[PDB]
Design a protein around this ligand. Structure first.
Ligand SMILES: Cc1cc2ccnc(N[C@@H]3C[C@H]4CC[C@@H](C3)N4C)c2[nH]c1=O
Length: 130
């Protein structure tokens, strides 16, 4: 229905805004674009589903997220990939893991404060009806 199209459009607007706020935070620059194969050629082999904030924006625009829950799965993926690929005690690895956890925590905190639980429930019920 038109009501439902409006609901998903509002979802996309909300998700773009959250994603933009993550993308402009200097701590999260490393997560704004796909990993360059020249610098990290073993990344494509180690990490089976790469994810980054530009790809998140592309997915929003492709209507790939019908709930905030599905969006947060990709945020969690950005984080889990960082923990998996950079597991060492090296300060470089520890920094990226801290930033990854910070990205995840920040996304969840914005959503906890600004997502109406009844809006998310509506999205889930439209999604589950298809
Ligand atoms: C998204 C992303 C980007 C990225 C860019 C550059 N290096 C990385 N990791 C290095 C692995 C080894 C080699 C050096 C250090 C840091 N670790 C010990 C990266 N890791 C990522 O997860």
């Amino acid at each position: 229905s038109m009501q439902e199209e409006d609901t998903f459009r509002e979802l996309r607007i909300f998700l773009r805004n959250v994603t933009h706020r993550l993308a402009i935070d200097k701590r999260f620059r490393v997560f704004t674009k796909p990993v360059d194969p020249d610098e990290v050629p073993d990344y494509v082999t180690v990490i089976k589903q790469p994810m980054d904030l530009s790809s998140v924006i592309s997915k929003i625009d492709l209507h790939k997220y019908l709930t905030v829950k599905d969006y947060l799965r990709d945020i969690d993926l950005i984080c889990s990939n960082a923990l998996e690929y950079n597991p060492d005690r090296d300060p470089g690895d520890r920094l990226i893991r801290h930033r990854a956890c910070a990205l995840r925590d920040t996304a969840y905190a914005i959503i906890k404060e600004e997502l109406d639980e009844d809006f998310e429930q509506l999205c889930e019920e439209i999604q589950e009806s298809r």
